[PDB]
Amino acid sequence: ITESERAYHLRKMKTRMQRVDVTGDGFISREDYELIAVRIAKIAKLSAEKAEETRQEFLRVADQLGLAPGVRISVEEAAVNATDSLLKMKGEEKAMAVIQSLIMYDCIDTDKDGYVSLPEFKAFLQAVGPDLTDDKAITCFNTLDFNKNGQISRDEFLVTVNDFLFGLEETALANAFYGDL
Ligand SMILES: [Ca+2]
Ligand SMILES: [Ca+2]
Ligand SMILES: [Ca+2]
């Protein structure tokens, strides 16, 4: 792994943590996960029943990540610890990290039809990136939609996640993920 490779990977990890920090305090906490769910519910005009299910799902992810009440990790620490951890992983641990990431797929799938639609992916991207234009969100969606069938399936999401977490050189995939480093 080169110095340029490591720096690229850190840029990706910084993008991830800055996008997740929707509260804008320079930390990652369960408040961030809750706000992303709340914003998705507004953007996607979810019913009150679906909005609460989605809020609970995001908080469950916060719980799985260890973001208990009062726990806050700086975006700087989060990003550094991510590049360090992920770049040390061998094959079996990589595979598990990728499967684990699919919990985020399920969160974004708010109608639970097992696919991520354009509305669902757009709601997610604009929840974490309020500055991202409708056009750019569509571009990001089209990047993940490998077969151009109008939905992001779990296979498409998974191969994208793998490149985002472990990729060492620039791709359109990694840019669409959050998207825009
Ligand atoms: Ca935050
Ligand atoms: Ca769906
Ligand atoms: Ca597709």
Swiss-Prot record:
Pfam families listed in its UniProt record: EF-hand_5 (PF13202), EF-hand_7 (PF13499)
EF-hand domain span: 8-43, 44-79, 96-131, 132-167
GO biological process terms on file: bioluminescence
The entry's keywords: Calcium, Luminescence, Metal-binding, Photoprotein, Repeat
InterPro entries: EF-hand-dom_pair (IPR011992), EF_Hand_1_Ca_BS (IPR018247), EF_hand_dom (IPR002048)
Residues binding Ca(2+) 1, per UniProt: D109, D111, D113, Y115, E120
Record carries keyword Signal: no
Residues at which Ca(2+) 2 binds: D145, N147, N149, Q151, E156
One GO MF term attached to the UniProt entry: calcium ion binding
Top-rank lineage group of the source organism: Eukaryota
Its biological purpose: This Ca(2+)-dependent protein binds to luciferin. The luciferin of LBP is capable of reacting with luciferase and O(2) only when calcium is bound.
Name of the molecule in the record: Luciferin-binding protein
Origin species: Renilla reniformis (Sea pansy)
